[PDB]
């Protein structure tokens, strides 16, 4: 469940980068096969992404590092 996004704004201190980071994570959960990093309570992808931002285990830097690591792994497995 989600009502207020204040803690997420505290973690990503712009509220305009928060929208972009949460949208990126929600599109990862929705279009991609990525699983949520938090036990969902039958929430939608946007609310799960916002909660993961609140719990602290995602931001723009973490998402970029994870994407770069997975791209490197896919390149290595390509041979």
């Amino acid at each position: 469940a989600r009502v207020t996004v204040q803690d997420a704004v505290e973690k990503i201190g712009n509220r305009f980068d928060l929208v972009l980071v949460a949208a990126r994570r929600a599109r990862q959960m929705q279009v991609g096969g990525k699983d949520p990093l938090v036990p969902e309570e039958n929430d939608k992808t946007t609310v799960i992404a916002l909660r993961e931002i609140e719990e602290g285990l995602i931001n723009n830097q973490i998402l970029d590092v994870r994407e770069r690591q997975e791209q490197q792994e896919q390149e290595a497995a390509e041979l």
Partner: protein, 98 residues
């Protein structure tokens, strides 16, 4: 009254008006300022492109929505091309650079 998709106008490919014609509410000039004040750039873009004039990016959004996806490939509103052609129908050459 409510409308998801219906008939669209002829010269400007926008949703029709009123309740008799299965028409959509007019996101007016003053509501655009309210979206600009919030900073809601993506909501505003999907208001004036996808669920409006832009015909090519309007069916792709419908397919995405009934595809499990929520993502738009926006283009140029077909009412701006109407404006370009109506200005070009005067003795005025108006064009897009690169």
């Amino acid at each position: 009254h409510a409308r998801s998709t219906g008939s669209y106008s002829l010269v400007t490919q926008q949703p029709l008006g009123g309740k008799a014609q299965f028409g959509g509410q007019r996101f007016g000039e003053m509501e655009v300022w309210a979206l600009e004040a919030y900073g809601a750039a993506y909501t505003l873009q999907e208001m004036l492109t996808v669920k409006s004039d832009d015909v090519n990016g309007r069916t792709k959004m419908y397919k995405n929505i009934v595809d499990g996806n929520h993502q738009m490939e926006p283009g140029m509103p077909e009412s701006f091309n109407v404006l370009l052609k109506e200005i070009r129908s005067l003795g005025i050459n108006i064009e897009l650079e690169d």
